[PDB]
Design a protein around this ligand. Sequence first.
Ligand SMILES: CCOc1nc(C(=O)NCC(=O)O)c(O)c2ccc(Oc3c(C)cc(C(=O)c4cc(F)cc(OC)c4)cc3C)cc12
Lengths: 11, 229
Amino acid sequence: ENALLRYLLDK
Amino acid sequence: HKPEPTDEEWELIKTVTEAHVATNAQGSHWKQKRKFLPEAFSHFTKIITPAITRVVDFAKKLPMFCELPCEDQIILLKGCCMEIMSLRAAVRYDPESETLTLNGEMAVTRGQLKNGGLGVVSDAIFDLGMSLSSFNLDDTEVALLQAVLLMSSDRPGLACVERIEKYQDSFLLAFEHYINYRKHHVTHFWPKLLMKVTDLRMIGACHASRFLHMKCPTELFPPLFLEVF
Ligand SMILES: CCOc1nc(C(=O)NCC(=O)O)c(O)c2ccc(Oc3c(C)cc(C(=O)c4cc(F)cc(OC)c4)cc3C)cc12
């Protein structure tokens, strides 16, 4: 999971 | 006499200080843009997501954080997010209105944050705010306190435990040397600051307890809030 956290970090 | 920061420590102090100042809500304008909440899941629901995001932005501006694998970054942010937000509210304690400021805008009372959903953790954050008055922490001291909570090697599931412990030791030495340079008019300042790191660590694990108790179906909780528990 952690899809939104993952997104915000890899931006 | 007591050791003052090295050149490499002054560079680390610049990086972490600027990272904090750039991600701290209304840094200059927080006290003059303050709106005192009337008399709250709703109003605290709205502001949690931007507060998590600012912590993410702070870590993302620390080069040492960016050298870690994604799964360690995720675990480290899960671990320090409420700790860092709590600290940021606590240093914005106004003793005359007895309020904390959330998101640079919302001044709240002990009662409002307690009945708003935080419960006894509200009392811990307000009591920390009161204690932190006489400490007179600057942006640099707050930023290093944040770097120390972020670089915690005892978070469950971490891969690069040794690397993270090494990063934390750099911050702790820089932090102690800055405290020596700053010559605060308080006895045993450094030992007392490390006790505050424990207070924030206790707040971080009580947020996690209260979270599991607040479960209201999960879809009422903002998505990013659920990810960092
Ligand atoms: C200082 C303690 O930590 C906090 N800090 C800040 C902050 O801005 N710090 C200063 C800075 O960063 O400059 C905040 O903005 C905070 C907002 C809310 C908060 O605690 C709740 C509360 C009070 C409610 C829900 C909810 O969204 C919720 C949703 C539900 F569906 C049910 C529910 O049950 C109560 C609660 C979720 C959180 C994190 C804690 C915050």
